[PDB]
Write a protein that binds this ligand. Sequence first.
Ligand SMILES: C=C1[C@@H](C)[C@H]2[C@H](Cc3ccccc3)NC(=O)[C@]23[C@H](OC(C)=O)/C=C/[C@@](C)(O)C(=O)[C@@H](C)C/C=C/[C@H]3[C@@H]1O
Ligand SMILES: Nc1ncnc2c1ncn2[C@@H]1O[C@H](COP(=O)(O)OP(=O)(O)OP(=O)(O)O)[C@@H](O)[C@H]1O
Ligand SMILES: [Ca+2]
Ligand SMILES: [Ca+2]
Length: 374
Amino acid sequence: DEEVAALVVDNGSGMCKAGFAGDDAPRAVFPSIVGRPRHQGVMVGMGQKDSYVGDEAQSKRGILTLKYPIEHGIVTNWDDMEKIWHHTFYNELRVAPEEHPVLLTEAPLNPKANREKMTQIMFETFNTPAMYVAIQAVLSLYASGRTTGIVLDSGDGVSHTVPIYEGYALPHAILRLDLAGRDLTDYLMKILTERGYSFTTTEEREIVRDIKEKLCYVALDFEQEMATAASSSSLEKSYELKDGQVITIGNERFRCPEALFQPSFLGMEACGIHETTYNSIMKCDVDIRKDLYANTVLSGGTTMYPGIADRMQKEITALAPSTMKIKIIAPPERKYSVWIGGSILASLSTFQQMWISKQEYDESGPSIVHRKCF
Ligand SMILES: C=C1[C@@H](C)[C@H]2[C@H](Cc3ccccc3)NC(=O)[C@]23[C@H](OC(C)=O)/C=C/[C@@](C)(O)C(=O)[C@@H](C)C/C=C/[C@H]3[C@@H]1O
Ligand SMILES: Nc1ncnc2c1ncn2[C@@H]1O[C@H](COP(=O)(O)OP(=O)(O)OP(=O)(O)O)[C@@H](O)[C@H]1O
Ligand SMILES: [Ca+2]
Ligand SMILES: [Ca+2]
């Protein structure tokens, strides 16, 4: 049916995912980074590379000063963001944007002007024939095969709880929590260095991430777990640096992600992801709360810790009404569920009328995004 393959671009704080609508996985996934040379160029006018994007900026981070154009889920540097999209189209996907409708993602509650800037860049710089900006949380719910539920999305720069009913999101019930994977990696660095090791440099942080994504987990009960670690040596695991040396980690394994439930460990006074989810549900209309409790979906890389689903189930229960059915959904590929939701949506029949056409943009201006998107 579809005359053209739509492109799906999920921009995140740490990783951007890109691909073609219709596919079940994104073709390209790389760091949302843009780097420039630390050292001044000796010659002028010889077209040498000035800016490095994604994996190439990573494979050369040593001689570059890196920038993250997306922080806390919000675009903060539009020149570099433009570079990431240019790189996505021409370097990763090898497509000409003017030949494809492009579906992009953004975080809820983001500045109005960013939504318009995105739309302007897509039409005036890349000349796309059509485009749309959708809320990440919503695509994740869709990828789970649901139109009803509350999504807890936790990435590298931010976390949001987004209540969704019969297909649409409830704007006023959406909550934002400035605590994500980035903060967790830094915290893991800290406590491990207190264990005796020494992780302070940027080159080190990189290995502390693998540890985190592979050795960390969410204890069902923090105190019992801490007790077991202080007496029993059964919760320790091994890890080897790039020097072949092996270093064992103990309670740090579950102490790191515990910050997700007790932000005070990071000096933050915000309430954990369980309380934030509850506060969102209670911000909803009592008539639908029951529905949300039974369809709490996990989305994003930081919700990948083993044991997080069962811990969430336990925490939410103690907060919800006794006779309130609680259920946590943890899709296996929730690391790319937002991209997958986009893939699905872009192919939907009732969604086609939603795309913002070049014609609509030409007649209504940037503000068209608010009417057709939000
Ligand atoms: C993926 C998104 C859009 C496709 C809408 C989607 C429903 C939909 C699906 C197919 C065809 C038409 C409409 N579910 C939503 O929450 C959206 C939908 O947006 C539109 C235009 O319906 C919802 C809008 C509101 C006002 O309810 C919002 O919550 C608003 C603040 C944020 C935007 C949400 C939209 C979301 O980004
Ligand atoms: N197995 C894992 N366990 C815990 N954390 C993980 C795991 N795998 C990846 N992460 C972390 O998830 C984060 C990346 O997730 P994701 O790509 O969803 O975020 P993002 O979209 O780039 O950023 P954001 O959505 O906050 O703007 C990183 O901190 C990564 O280290
Ligand atoms: Ca994201
Ligand atoms: Ca606290």
